Symmetry: C3
């Protein structure tokens, strides 16, 4: 499960590398490989934090549309389920994760970036919810993740139009956390990730878990899970 | 029939509330908004919608002389039809823009928030005025306000009932653009026309999923997103 | 009784936490916060509340030395009473303002966030410090932090446990006003007094619905909003 996606470990941190030139367009196979990569990263104790990276040229132009056009409805349905499984798995990695975004983050590419805990972006990057340009809509929970950061009205403007927005606008909207020169994206992402290597890993995992649940779970379930995680940490 | 109209022109409709002098909305006005919102969803001569109260005023909100005379079961019914009207407008499966002039107060602000976007006159006054009559905002107003501005600001506005100007509304994210009073309707029409050439079934599905973000539990949200995605995809293969 | 005090003055009450030198909250302080908050909610002669730890400090958070003497089931019970205290303050059916001086750290930051508004000294340090003890914020802190600042910033703050100043809190939306250290209490009082002549039933119902926005599932929200709205028309409540 690693023709296009690889996990590269180095000095306590790992890079999940998507490499499917020239746009890192994600086919069904790429999504399966992201699922396996996310699982591997969660369990590896030589890895304390993760950088998501497509290479210096591009993060991802999104779904592979030509593949999609060859599928029938049940195959497309399965593709949509694996897409969500991939995006969720990346979001749930029990370690701090940063998207090192270069070139373009479009459609499912933007959704993938939004699954990371933080995003460091090149100042030349173009973003966009391009799915509507194919007569489709964003999958993998993209519209939900977008909406919680920018609000409904802006979410609709971006998704309905499918327009490109620059890194400066992404920064102003809160969709990326830092903007740097194109040659420094990966190195800045690595530096952000390294900031957490000396933290208690189970506590980070627990904090991430509760934070991510804030918009997902009903209040009683949120409280039960927070308390359980707190007591666990305490009992260890 | 009586206070709310749908006026279609060049592919676009204006949903017009007209109940002088303040476009105060009674129970009847809300029922008429529900009928107008359903009509607008069904009509294929209509690709996008502008909500409009006329050049003078959008709406001062609930009709307080009516509300003040109701008992608890009548208030229950009033609260339902108000919510039904706001949600109907919110669910219109087409891009919708509020062309806000004069005032958007109480249920009037809520109605404006039910549009996808708001273009406001620079002289408009906004406010959650319900508490000035001893009441609270209905129609899910407090939720829609809170999700845009956060709890602390939502409370300050709703507890005080104070008026705020269009500059503050813009800074709070409660409106999307501010223009001269005489240009509000025309600018609203121009924002609405920007989407007339989009794929209508995809827009409808996108709008539906975005609106469901705060309305459905996570499993139901993911299922509905996938179903809509697959329907769009199958339809385009077929013809 | 021992660490938490209620002081009333023409419609305005101050809930005072005093457990020097840091107003660290032990299990007993949380029980006392619960009882004081409930009392304040009941009292119809009180139209608003200021939360205050004195001129020097709001709270440095959980009493960690107490916590280190507990076993896991006791810690579980401690965690439930912590939540009960935060929620009790959040649910006070009257406008409430936190007069934050000195430090608001860990459960102390959570407590300030339970108030409707926060007026802070410009020299105050804030922080989600629980991770520095190998723990995580309790009392629903992470949820309350996340709704204001968003996930990405919530994580940065909670994962690091770093201190942030009043200027950064203001820019993040975590406090509503920043004033000189000597003016915190007075400004909190003036803010609270602005609402003393509002219709109390309507404030209560509005506060309850606004707080439920992130607490209840959508069908439960619509039902509870409608119930509270209709109550304003009920025979005994007009």
């Amino acid at each position: 499960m690693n023709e296009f996606v690889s996990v590269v470990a180095d000095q306590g941190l790992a890079t999940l590398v998507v490499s499917r030139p020239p746009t890192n367009a994600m086919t069904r196979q790429v999504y399966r490989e992201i699922v396996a990569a996310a699982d591997e990263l969660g369990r590896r104790d030589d890895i304390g934090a993760v950088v998501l990276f497509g290479g210096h040229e591009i993060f991802s132009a999104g779904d592979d549309m030509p593949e999609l056009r060859t599928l029938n409805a049940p195959e497309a349905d399965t593709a949509a389920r694996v897409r969500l499984e991939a995006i969720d798995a990346v979001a749930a990695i029990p370690k701090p994760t940063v998207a090192a975004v270069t070139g373009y983050a479009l459609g499912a590419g933007l959704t993938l970036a939004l699954a990371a805990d933080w995003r460091v972006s090149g100042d030349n990057v173009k973003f966009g919810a391009t799915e509507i340009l194919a007569g489709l809509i964003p999958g993998g929970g993209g519209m939900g993740r977008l909406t919680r950061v920018v609000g409904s009205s802006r979410a609709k403007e971006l998704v309905f139009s499918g327009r490109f927005f620059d890194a400066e606008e992404a920064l102003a909207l809160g969709l990326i956390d830092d903007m740097v020169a194109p040659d420094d994206v990966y190195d800045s992402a690595v530096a952000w990730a390294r900031r957490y290597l000396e933290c208690p890993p189970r506590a980070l995992a627990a904090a991430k878990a509760v934070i991510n649940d804030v918009f997902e779970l009903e209040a009683t379930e949120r409280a039960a899970a927070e308390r359980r995680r707190y007591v666990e940490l305490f009992a260890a």
